[PDB]
Amino acid sequence: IHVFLILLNGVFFRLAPLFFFLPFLNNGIISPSIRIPVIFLVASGLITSGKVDIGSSVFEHVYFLMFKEIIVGLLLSFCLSLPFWIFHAVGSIIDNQRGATLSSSIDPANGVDTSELAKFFNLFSAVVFLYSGGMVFILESIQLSYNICPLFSQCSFRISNILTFLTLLASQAVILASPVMIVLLLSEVLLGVLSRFAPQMNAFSVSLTIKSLLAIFIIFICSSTIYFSKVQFFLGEHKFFTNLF
Amino acid sequence: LSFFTLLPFLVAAGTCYIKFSIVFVMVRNALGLQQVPSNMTLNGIALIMALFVMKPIIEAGYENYLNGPQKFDTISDIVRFSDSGLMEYKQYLKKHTDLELARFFQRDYSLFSLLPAYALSEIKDAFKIGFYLYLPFVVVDLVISSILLALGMMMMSPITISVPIKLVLFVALDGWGILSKALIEQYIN
Amino acid sequence: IATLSFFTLLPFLVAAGTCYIKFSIVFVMVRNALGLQQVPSNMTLNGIALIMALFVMKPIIEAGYESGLMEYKQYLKKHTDLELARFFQDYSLFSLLPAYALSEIKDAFKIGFYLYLPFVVVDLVISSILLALGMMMMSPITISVPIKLVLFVALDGWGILSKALIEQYIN
Amino acid sequence: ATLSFFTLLPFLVAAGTCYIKFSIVFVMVRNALGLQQVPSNMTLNGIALIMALFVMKPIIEAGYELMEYKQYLKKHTDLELARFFQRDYSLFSLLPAYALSEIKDAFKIGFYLYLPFVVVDLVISSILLALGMMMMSPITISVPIKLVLFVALDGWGILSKALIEQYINI
Amino acid sequence: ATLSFFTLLPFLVAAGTCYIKFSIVFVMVRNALGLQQVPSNMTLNGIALIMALFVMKPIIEAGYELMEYKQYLKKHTDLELARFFQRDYSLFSLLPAYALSEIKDAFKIGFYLYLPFVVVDLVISSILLALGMMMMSPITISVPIKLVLFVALDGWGILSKALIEQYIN
Amino acid sequence: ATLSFFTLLPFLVAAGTCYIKFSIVFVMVRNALGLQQVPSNMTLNGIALIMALFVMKPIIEAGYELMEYKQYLKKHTDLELARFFQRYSLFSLLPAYALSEIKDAFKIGFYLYLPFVVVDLVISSILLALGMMMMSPITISVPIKLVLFVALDGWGILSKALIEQYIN
Amino acid sequence: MSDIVYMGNKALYLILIFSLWPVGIATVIGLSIGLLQTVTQLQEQTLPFGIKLIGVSISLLLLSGWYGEVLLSFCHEIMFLIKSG
Amino acid sequence: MSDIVYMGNKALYLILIFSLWPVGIATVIGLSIGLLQTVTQLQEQTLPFGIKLIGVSISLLLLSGWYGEVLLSFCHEIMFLIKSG
Amino acid sequence: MSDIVYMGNKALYLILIFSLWPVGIATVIGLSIGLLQTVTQLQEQTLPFGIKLIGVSISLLLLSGWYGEVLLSFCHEIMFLIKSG
Amino acid sequence: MSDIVYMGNKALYLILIFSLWPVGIATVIGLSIGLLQTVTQLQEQTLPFGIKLIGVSISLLLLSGWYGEVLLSFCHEIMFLIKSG
């Protein structure tokens, strides 16, 4: 047992960035005495189920495949955690719409950074993902990453598709927010009309009062657009991450 | 100094520790309390509770460890001890691991190919339960935020004010007692 | 491996089985009560709580240092809930640790809610008198900390708090 | 001496590589929209991290298999500022000069794009005051108009496509 | 067991030395001046540790030769609160009383110097509401005035001279 | 004794080196511009650490074989403040140096924190004179507070004027 | 995953049914005394927090018992969902 | 848990008592100087803050002794309850 | 705790004194230009910041020494209270 | 701190100097059409803002060179003082 562990760190530093920013294995929700043994169990389960490929490899390659796997395993983490980062987006552009974290939208020092509705959506979508083939899909996505550039390959990955990532994450977030956001703006423009026809009121306070509750009411009568983006995302991460490399 | 150090965590990975040591950590993050039920405290409470759950597994496996004879210190004999020397923790693993995730660590199961499947199954299940616990602490959190923005005051954060209400909701619930009872009755019937 | 496998688990047995729980959930909640997020410096409060827990555990430590402890066992059946120690079941040691730990977490949250509360009253008062005055945009965390400290030094503060919190264990 | 290896590696990637240029421009676009959370800080510090590691990929692959990295420093450092620290070159007298050159260029290129957002903010505020009403906050109206006009202008795609082409041939 | 020697030594420093008195006061000065990030919190832990180790220096090298540190503890411990943790003196009966007395004293000396900054914050808030506007947060405008009121005081020099003369005659 | 040193290596860096002088200033420049998130505080720790270790280079590369370190402390300590801790030994040069550079870094930061709030109040003044009140001038004031900083050669002349006190 | 949808819509219903009463009283009082800052000219954007604060007090202190019991009878239902499978 | 209920209702009572006086004086001065912003033209929202600021000093520097004592007589009783089990 | 009570009372006194001048000058200049909202057509809720902005500056640019000196000599008094007991 | 007296009082000087013109042109042209809000029937606060946005801008487009040579020279003075202690 000397060659057993040189294959073990190469799977560690591919899968340890998969737990960092995957918001049901790290929002500070598992202890740092759990991350290291959970990865040393999952990695030991992967390299005895035969889900690797020989590179016939030593004499310059201890820290050399370190920086390799971080450029690969992060790319596995990023297209795998796209929906949660939409819902953690779609919480924010709902509660910064109604003014929850509008305290820190002026002086970002002593107010709200990680708010109270975005954490609710970020756990709720993690649960809805996690029932519907949660850890199976992630772990076969790890073997799909192993199908392309296992741990000894060159990983000369295609460029211009990880640069459209963040506009994908913005486009889906604004489109998915669109039933909530435009009615809040219709309400606030209508109350601006009311402030024009009565130029003495506090339009800001009266705007906040109705415009928080109306947002939480519109999130309630949705019932439809919560789960069915993840079949799209199943086919998506089978397609995108295949054509990223 | 890793196998000298992380072996009390590798062994305590995939017994029952994960199942508690997320949920308590997910109850602390649910109350708005960012640090105060200290991490080195809650990872101790979860450890002693999980070792209580594992004690009738541990001594009755140590009986099979002790009578033996079980010549050791090689690869094949420890694999033989993992099935024909334990025989009841493996049934404990088969009880709580998914019939669709333990098949992933394969090519009538063994032992070493269920511990990652068991660890991820408990991360899955503990995250389910921790979301159900998080779920009535955001009704109070969003009610306080809504009636606090509705009462003019926007700049003051509800993280300061909600914690008395998120604890008068929680100690009157009986709190860690009814939670730990309802969470340990899954493992001790 | 025994000289590190017994040392790695030992902070968990101090912060899980001793009286440390009862202080480490209170004092770090005193800090978050005042609005101060960092300044009493968690490295420090986990030292105050640890030496004050070692002061309580000291007649247990030197007695058991000489079925081995048996005064720690009798210590556990004094702050454990009676209707919760019957759920984790003569008695033992390790069937008595988790009932004690859960009992002190529940009692420490009750103590913490008692003292988190005479500060949120003055926090909401400063916010109300600072909105009705008009100055809506300024955060009252700047103004509220002097009043939440003059309200706490006039209490005599940490002295009478640790007195009233250690009288349950030493009397 | 591998304790100083992993510890000083965030203090070398965020200080000596191209992570400065992206970690400032991205978080400067986010703060311009008013919405300072919806791309997360953990999100932007992952996009900028892989966008910096892909630029550092041929440099590390050529160097560890340091003269290639010094060519990368000398190409992008201001010569008017690198000569001050040398009072050819050495390595360690360029990383402060390179880091300050990238911070100055980051604020320069970030300010060149921060400007069409404040003019649409002033457009929204001016058309709100021109329609009588004044006593309403136009930040909350302007923020989704600063989103849906930024997403439909292809946004981060047209941004970061020419923010790494300054450092690579794509 | 040199690890249990060493894993408690930060608890002996932050609990039994004079590190409490500076690690509360300095770290509260950062919170006092509005900007709660600026002197790089680990920096203030550095300054407070080197100053507390300076104060403990005639106990540190005079311990490597023990009835010279408890006599330090008896000087700054409360008279009546050390008697509560008693029932001469002993060891493991003063460090709680010493630590609680210096936390109380640190909050007192902290509230003394916290106070001439909330007055200038409320002054700036009042002149900024009286100047028509409401929406601009005065945390921005407060910080340069809260620093011109601090640097012109001689600042950290006169503060640490006022704060360390209690422990050195 | 090999883990008794790395537990105090960052304390000697952030308390005894030139790091203080930069890590107060640049973090204050981030807070000065009104954009108090974007230069990514670990980045500023990186810039300040490499720029401080550049000054420490003739001290470390002559100290690996200390006397020039004590000379470095005696050069950058106030006359009117080293006398107090003196009432030679290493532990009495450290706190006077650390407090001297905290006071000097707050002075240097105050000199530069000041030409930004004047343009902040200019933008607030022209915003209220132009009718509008409910819109905060933070978002509108950021680009002007930064174009005032780019046209000052950015961070170049700032770091030159901040490091020339240490390289004669 | 029916339990998640039912608990999530029940939480978003409890937020609405709790926050409908005091936020509704707050916006009725704010809009109404804004209408008294119309034709009887009393143009001050400093008034209504003096009156909204009492309504949100009275409509909470009258109703804080109910805020307990359903939200406690809610919190036990969830407990059954973790005494189940 | 009835002690928790009594302490919580006493806290809501102390918030409402301590914010009846100065918020009430502030809104009474605001409404009463809005009465001078009636037919006697004073249509500027500046003079209320010039006078409300002194009121919530005068109703707060005269009265803060009482704000001490009851709020300290509260803070001892809580300490009494944690002198118990 | 008479030192603490004296420092707190002097703090409220310094708030009231240091804000009595510029708020008073601001509202006097505002009401003085509001006397031109008589029969002369000057109904604008935008004009007085055109003058009030100079007034708050003039009673502070000409008065920054006083705002210095006592508020600096106050900061020495506190220092005395922490140099002594 | 004697140079801080000179640098600090020059900060309030530039608040007076650099904001005299753009507020002043705003309170002249905004008062010029405010003088067209006299007996001339143009009672709007809608068209006397689009003339004020363009009224400030001509005093902000042409006069912006006065903001350049001396506010940088004010910052070149500051950069010269910090080369000393």
Author numbering:
A (entry chain F): 10 to 254
B (entry chain A): 11 to 117, 132 to 213
C (entry chain B): 8 to 73, 94 to 116, 132 to 213
D (entry chain E): 9 to 73, 96 to 117, 132 to 214
E (entry chain C): 9 to 73, 96 to 117, 132 to 213
F (entry chain D): 9 to 73, 96 to 117, 133 to 213
G (entry chain G), H (entry chain H), I (entry chain I), J (entry chain J): 1 to 85
From the article:
Export of proteins through type III secretion systems (T3SS) is critical for motility and virulence of many major bacterial pathogens.
Many of the systems proved fragile, with little to no SctS (FliQ) associated with the purified complexes, but the Shigella flexneri export gate (Spa24, Spa9, and Spa29—here referred to as SctRST) could be purified at sufficient levels to allow structure determination by single-particle cryo-EM. Here we present the structure of an equivalent complex from the Shigella virulence system at 3.5 Å by cryo-electron microscopy. As suggested by the nMS analysis, the biggest difference between the flagellar and injectisome export gates was observed in the Q/S subunits. The highest-resolution SctRST map was generated from ∼200,000 particles and displayed density for 4 copies of SctS, but with evidence that the 4th copy, corresponding to the lowest position in the helical assembly, was substoichiometrically occupied. Further three-dimensional (3D) classification of this particle set produced a series of lower-resolution maps highlighting the compositional heterogeneity within the SctRST sample, with evidence for SctR5S2T1, SctR5S3T1, and SctR5S4T1 complexes. This observation is in agreement with the nMS data and supports the hypothesis that the complex is assembled sequentially, with the SctS component being the last to be added.
